[PDB]
Structure 1
Amino acid sequence: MEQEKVQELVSQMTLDEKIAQCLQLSPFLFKGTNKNAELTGPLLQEMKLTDAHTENAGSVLGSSSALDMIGIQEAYLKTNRLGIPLVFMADVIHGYKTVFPIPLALGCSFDRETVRVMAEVSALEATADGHHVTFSPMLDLVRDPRWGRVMESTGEDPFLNSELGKAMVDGYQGDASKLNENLEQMAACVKHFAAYGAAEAGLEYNTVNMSTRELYQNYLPAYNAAIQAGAKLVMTAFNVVDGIPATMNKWLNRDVLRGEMEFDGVLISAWGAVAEVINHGTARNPKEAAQFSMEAGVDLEMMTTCYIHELKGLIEEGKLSENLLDEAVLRMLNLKNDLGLFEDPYRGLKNNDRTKDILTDESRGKARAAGVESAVLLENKSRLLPLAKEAKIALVGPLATSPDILGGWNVYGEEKDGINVETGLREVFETVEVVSTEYTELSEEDKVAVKAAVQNMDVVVLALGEKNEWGGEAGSLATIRLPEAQYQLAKFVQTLGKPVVITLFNGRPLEVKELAESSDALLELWFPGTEAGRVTADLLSGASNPSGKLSMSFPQTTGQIPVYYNHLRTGRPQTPENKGERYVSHYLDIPNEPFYPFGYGKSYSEFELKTSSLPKELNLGESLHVEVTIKNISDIAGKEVIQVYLQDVTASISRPVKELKAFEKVALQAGEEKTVTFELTSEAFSFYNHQLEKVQEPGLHRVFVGTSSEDVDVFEVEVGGYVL
């Protein structure tokens, strides 16, 4: 409808109506739900909610199906005075019913189109079940694999994170200004604003602290890119940002998000984060929490009651302007209008059962493709892999048969539709002997049984991994290791004298040195989603050629953390030339380098890269154009990820030794050659100075072109002169 009609609605609502429009509730707090109605009575009572509240609530969180939605919306519109339909929101993080790889695995793809397609398929299905908004992309930079929520990030690089964030937004939303017509796309909600990934000691919800400059330099750019690409909502973070919980942090959310980033959509709280500012010790009570969170421009309180119980008295007493409440309501109604909910509150479902669009074969194929793009081949000694279809396989370990391959933050997908490792292998390989073992134990009887199966077969597929419940939210591990039993199983299998491939499933970097040394090949599958066993079987047999690169550094040991490729030099760097001197930046007991670096991943193919003549000089404001010719010089078709890094040699702030500024994943048949070109704009050369100005300084930059952060040729470009 026309904007005048939306503004009119605001004018006509009562104060009590405007307040309740700022509340989101679980579906079973509403009449007309068709699941968990036994939770409704006691929980309404604990939260002290009445019909006056629920019949005017702004939003529903986590509907269970199209029918839940339809029934809830229908009963709500019988009783709502002005006819304002509910907006339905959900967590569609890496797939709805067709589950794609976890975001961190999608980071390792380095493939923007894989990510867009995952987001498109997710929206297709999620809209078919009545959801209007997804709480994705998660854009928290991560340098600390202790934190369970690394699985939801695309990793340690702001540039990569930004680029894949934009891809996800584009895939979920399509053309943002036509969400009232394109009812198979949905609104995206960027989360968690801001810097939640920097949780101290990797502990869930724990203190975050960095300088404002570092916040701008590394922690904000990805949210920003997703905002500028049209993300409709933003969600606040749990953590403090320079001492103030992000939810009530006025500077953060008004000055930065709404001012600098020019965000003018719904700011929704993370779950309970409005009330939790009390726990943080920056509000005395719910009256202060409500006031501070509304001052900071939070429009929508997720499942707590500070707003509904306290805004009236605040406004009546004049501690809080009613204009701020009106601004919040207007953003909520604009969101609804942007989804076409005032013409069609059932968003395409009312006379159109779209069951047919859910978990199709086309969709499963895309997830399989996603899975094969995201896996990272870490070791392959002796060209053990690809295995031949007639190789006789002993498939052993906790991930041989486990149905737990869909990943954390799989709110809607079902393990029964998933393909386990065994089932995946038996479609491809004629001889497989299996010995399942438990995640945390290694018994004598297991060893006997493993030994018998290995004696029978020619190669071992050792499937190790985490349960998903060991990560995700509030799955923090102080020591980033598999259970010791799995390391002991890898040690045992090694003694059996047969070649070993380890297929590792997990949601975080782990200490894998012991696994690499106990096997001939090591394939990092992360959690691939619905098609996990086929992803695995196609990569092992070579029907697919691994092409993933690490988007997060794998530490030598827990105590190396944080370790990341874009690090400062320090005043006493170790060099190949001073190696072994005492008075340099090193550890006595491990290497400075991570076990595996950002951008690292093997292939069954071999590539050669050639960079065309770069200029020796560039003007300020001028783009650098990088042309690179890649050739597949092997007999095996495959894909390589070309990466370009920039370094600022001398600057008014100590700058990272490299930063990624471009990447493209290039597909090449055996003997095929391509030229790809990159533009590094002058923004790729700029950074935040100690005055928090985004600046370009004249001087020397090095440019690194290659296939990891370590495998690069280096070039020098001197920036100076005039500007543009």
Structure 2
Amino acid sequence: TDKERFIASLMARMSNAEKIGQLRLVSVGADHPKEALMADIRAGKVGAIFNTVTRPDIRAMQDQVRHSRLKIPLFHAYDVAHGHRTIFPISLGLAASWDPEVVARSARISALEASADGLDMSFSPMVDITRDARWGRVSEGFGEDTYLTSLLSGVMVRAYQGSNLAAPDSIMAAVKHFALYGAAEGGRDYNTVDMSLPRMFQDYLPPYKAAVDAGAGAVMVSLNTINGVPATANRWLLTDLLRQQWGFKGLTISNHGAVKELIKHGLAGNERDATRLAIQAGVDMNMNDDLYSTWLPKLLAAGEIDQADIDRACRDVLAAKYDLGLFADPYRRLGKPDDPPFDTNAESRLHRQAAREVAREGLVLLKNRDGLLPLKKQGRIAVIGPLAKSQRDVIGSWSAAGVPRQAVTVYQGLANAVGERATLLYAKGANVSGDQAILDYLNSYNPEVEVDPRSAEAMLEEALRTARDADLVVAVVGESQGMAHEASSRTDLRIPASQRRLLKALKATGKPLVLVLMNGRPLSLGWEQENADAILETWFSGTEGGNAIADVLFGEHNPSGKLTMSFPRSVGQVPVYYNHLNTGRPMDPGKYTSRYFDEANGPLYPFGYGLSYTEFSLSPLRLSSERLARGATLEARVTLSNSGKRAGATVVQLYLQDPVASLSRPVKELRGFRKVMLEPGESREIVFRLGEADLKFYDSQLRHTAEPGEFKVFVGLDSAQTESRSFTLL
């Protein structure tokens, strides 16, 4: 209420011009040249900045505020998605850690680095559920599961915002993209989203609510339609749900041009009408298109909006700044006047230890025939493929202020790990794509892919010569990071054809073949699963990726990563996800079942899958009783043993099924997990606790209750290989 008092006294002093100026969020560029923008800040016409990311540049902008009548400070934002300068694995790789503390650490270090550069806010976490592998932005989320993504949503917010949003090493989380953005039809970015309310409430909305309940300060509004209404114009979504039902008290931010794009969506015929729809829906802050500054005065004078629409939006911007500590000290993240200057990109400001330890936890072992991995540091290892020496790709998409030249390649990680104990032989083998039109797409803004001027044939002949001179081949293959970014949707989920030709040529040498995969989405890997001797999924593993990958390949780290998104056998099976409905004719096999005829059915690799260099055993599942009273707790116990020869971690997963309900419920739903590190011969009793809240679902009328009757409890080391027992809720 100090905050409410402070904001009400400030707003009672402000003109409408000053209130509207708070709603303007801009980036320096063609549309807002630096000197003109500086003059607007001085006039009180700017509320905040994004994409200005160094302390002297931010401090210069904050200095301009002292010229405005009320000297209301700016906040500065950036897309710190999975690292600021030190780049962690992409979020899909962090999720595969199954370890909230690992994910927390990446977020904390991101906030530490971003706040050290003067940033107040990140447009993160991204908590959109993804069941469609074709979407470019699957790399930005935590996979297909509502429970896990909801958990990590809360973890990311708490880790960014810390104990106090006014702390100089805290940043505000702007959770995105509200809402349902990863359900785009056809996996085409920005495309139509259409879904029932029970699916929306049960599966898609809970991660956004988890962020709000963790106290997220901001929400970034999505670019897509929800059931015909763009999120930027959706009063039900942004007012009724987010504010009135969920109690969100923070700031809504539009995406770039989102208010103007209501004209392309066909909700508005002109910019004046687009502005009215966005502010009355509940969008507080207008990114870059400047429609609010242009049209809000005219709309109010015409009685087309209410003073309360402006007041709500302005209070939310001021409340964000208040919580960030900026009214107490606008320079709290910008140090002192005549602090000595520093190199923003100095090696001494990176966190390589943390990036290497985090990156180890996300690597997923998918195949390991006859214990080929871990490798011994000996002999001659051929390192082949267009991603082996790529610094640009290892840091991934949404690499923020990450510097490619600071990153450790797979080749360099292997060189560092073996030193003089083994000989590495390098050949590029193929370009990332053989299709010049795809290479031109990827290099269209910036040179992001090195195109070897040699023929495909010459590169292959060199790679075969290299393979013949080696004891075994480490093929580093998959996507370049520009294939799994905003607007980069794919119609094919395989490794690119140029690289598959290389893999088929390398297989024909008879040399043991280890695949190191880099990719930002599930890939179709049927040929690789049949033909490679071992397969390690490394996503894009970040600044220290090459070192983390070498640590796993040589057995310094026993792989512990597990998939959080199902890998389809082909793009033609989309969508595939573990928490699907049974249907009336489930596939076991019979012709008259829910299936395809022209390919094997089910995912190639299921949700929760990942191998180890050791063996684990689970004892029989035991429940604390066969009947559960309302308000009572059920315990599900299992003993995990390391029955192999190497220390390692696995993830014990708990799944629930509600086999008779008022709605058809999923064949199983994740409801808990434990990541457990065990030395050989160690045993751990795992105790899962379940209550009524774990058993609730949204019915056809969106009643959120648990119905009496049977529940099935499954425990295992993936979604496919479980044991189950039942109990009855009374």
TM-score band by shorter chain is: over 0.9
Provide the C-alpha distance between the structure 2 equivalents of 1:211 and 1:702, rounded to a whole number of angstroms. 26
1:498 aligns with 2:511: yes
Q: What's the offset of the Cα at 1:568?
A: 0.1
2:452 corresponds to: none
CA shift in 2, pair 1:53/1:197, >3 Å: farther
CA shift in 2, pair 1:557/1:457, >3 Å: same
Contact 1:386–1:539 (8 Å) recurs in 2: yes
Equivalent residues in 2 for 1:595-606, closer than 5 Å:
595-606=604-615
How big is each residue's C-alpha offset from its partner over 1:344-370, in whole Å with a ceiling of 9 and x where there is no partner? Answer: 112232315696997658821111111
1:515 corresponds to: 528
Provide the C-alpha distance between the structure 1 equivalents of 2:177 and 2:327, rounded to a whole number of angstroms. 29
Residue ranges of structure 1 left out of the alignment (5+ in a row):
none
1:249 aligns with 2:234: yes
Q: What's the offset of the Cα at 1:623?
A: 2.8
Q: What's the offset of the Cα at 1:620?
A: 3.0
Match 1:260 to one of 227, 230, 245 = 245
Over 4 Å off, 4+ runs: 28-31, 352-362
1:309 corresponds to: 294
Equivalent residues in 2 for 1:458-473, closer than 5 Å:
458-473=471-486
Amino acid at match of 2:547: R
1:559 aligns with 2:572: yes
Contact 2:41–2:61 (8 Å) recurs in 1: no
2:394 counterpart SS class: coil
2:174 counterpart SS class: strand
Q: TM-score, normalising length from structure 2?
A: 0.93
Amino acid at match of 2:468: Q
Provide the C-alpha distance between the structure 1 equivalents of 2:203 and 2:342, rounded to a whole number of angstroms. 42
Amino acid at match of 1:597: P
Comparing 702-711 with 615-624, greater Cα deviation is found at 615-624
Residue ranges of structure 2 left out of the alignment (5+ in a row):
435-454
Provide the C-alpha distance between the structure 2 equivalents of 1:433 and 1:665, rounded to a whole number of angstroms. 37
Match 2:661 to one of 641, 651, 659 = 651
Equivalent residues in 2 for 1:271-350, closer than 5 Å:
271-350=256-335
Q: What's the offset of the Cα at 1:149?
A: 0.3
How big is each residue's C-alpha offset from its partner over 1:513-536, in whole Å with a ceiling of 9 and x where there is no partner? Answer: 122222100000000000111111
Match 1:662 to one of 668, 672, 675 = 672
2:153 corresponds to: 165
Q: What's the offset of the Cα at 1:54?
A: 6.2
Amino acid at match of 1:23: R
1:156 corresponds to: 144
Match 1:572 to one of 568, 585, 588 = 585
1:109 counterpart SS class: coil
2:442 corresponds to: none
CA shift in 2, pair 1:87/1:519, >3 Å: same
Contact 2:623–2:635 (8 Å) recurs in 1: no
Amino acid at match of 2:51: G
1:25 aligns with 2:26: yes
1:315 counterpart SS class: helix
Contact 1:208–1:241 (8 Å) recurs in 2: yes
Provide the C-alpha distance between the structure 2 equivalents of 1:615 and 1:356, rounded to a whole number of angstroms. 62
How big is each residue's C-alpha offset from its partner over 1:266-316, in whole Å with a ceiling of 9 and x where there is no partner? Answer: 010112111111110011211111111111111101111221111111111
Amino acid at match of 1:689: D
Equivalent residues in 2 for 1:53-132, closer than 5 Å:
55-77=44-66, 79-132=67-120
2:497 corresponds to: 484
Match 1:424 to one of 413, 419, 433 = 413
1:179 aligns with 2:192: no
Q: What's the offset of the Cα at 1:680?
A: 2.1
1:8 counterpart SS class: helix
2:594 corresponds to: 585
2:96 counterpart SS class: helix
CA shift in 2, pair 1:673/1:505, >3 Å: same
How big is each residue's C-alpha offset from its partner over 1:41-64, in whole Å with a ceiling of 9 and x where there is no partner? Answer: 6xx7xxxx9838963211101113
Amino acid at match of 1:209: D
Equivalent residues in 2 for 1:606-685, closer than 5 Å:
606-610=615-619, 611-685=621-695
Provide the C-alpha distance between the structure 2 equivalents of 1:158 and 1:655, rounded to a whole number of angstroms. 14
Contact 1:461–1:503 (8 Å) recurs in 2: yes
1:433 corresponds to: 425
Contact 2:124–2:173 (8 Å) recurs in 1: yes
Provide the C-alpha distance between the structure 1 equivalents of 2:3 and 2:199, rounded to a whole number of angstroms. 42
| Aligned CA-pair RMSD | 1.9
Q: What's the offset of the Cα at 1:3?
A: 3.8
Provide the C-alpha distance between the structure 2 equivalents of 1:493 and 1:218, rounded to a whole number of angstroms. 43
Amino acid at match of 1:136: S
How big is each residue's C-alpha offset from its partner over 1:401-444, in whole Å with a ceiling of 9 and x where there is no partner? Answer: 11221000012100111001111101112310110132124722
Comparing 438-447 with 515-524, greater Cα deviation is found at 438-447
Amino acid at match of 1:57: V
Q: What's the offset of the Cα at 1:614?
A: 3.6
1:324 counterpart SS class: helix
Q: What's the offset of the Cα at 1:5?
A: 2.7
Provide the C-alpha distance between the structure 1 equivalents of 2:41 and 2:87, rounded to a whole number of angstroms. 39
Provide the C-alpha distance between the structure 2 equivalents of 1:345 and 1:75, rounded to a whole number of angstroms. 12
